Amino acid sequence: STDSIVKASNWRLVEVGRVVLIKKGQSAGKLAAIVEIIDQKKVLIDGPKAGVPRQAINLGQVVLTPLTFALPRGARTATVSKKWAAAAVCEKWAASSWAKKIAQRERRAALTDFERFQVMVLRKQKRYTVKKALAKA
Template structure:
């Protein structure tokens, strides 16, 4: 599993410093670090990309990445320092789920004509692949 892949069973891995992906609200799609556990359903998160806030665990996905040695209830400046030391943004940008998410967003932003062009290119690729397979099959 890559450094920032999303972990399926969430609650046992909740800890200070755990990097989470926010799935709901105005900061949807952004990463943050758990600063403090409020109760069994809510956590306090902070990062250089969002403002410090309490979120429900049901509105976040935990990643396998942890900002190590982050003190509990650290202020925003401290969180930003540890965030940069851990290279969270670089590791997240190189992860497969981040690339897949960016691809999905790109597809959603296509216009009708752009979707048509993609369909035509897929048909052309499929035709070439089938032609190559048939040629290989015939020669063997």
């Protein structure tokens, strides 16, 4: 074909309205929305729904999530919070496999010893059925 099949080269771009997850500091594990850009390495974020106060944070401590929503440039806390509810980014993040894995690991860390024994018994029961299915096809 004559079309330019050249790869699209998809990239997670940092932009106004992008929602990111903080991986360090007191606000670790909380979502924040980028409001404005300070420089090539520093950005302004606001996560009032997540409870993180507005502050300037280096991109080194921030990882960009695939989710994005429209935010006017320089939007204050009230506007950012309103757009957060309008876009329902929290529900989309929860439905994402990343949040599912985070919640799964968090629950695993808190599992009780009796809960651990129950998990082992359930895993054995599931394995029994799974191996019964195998060799029968």
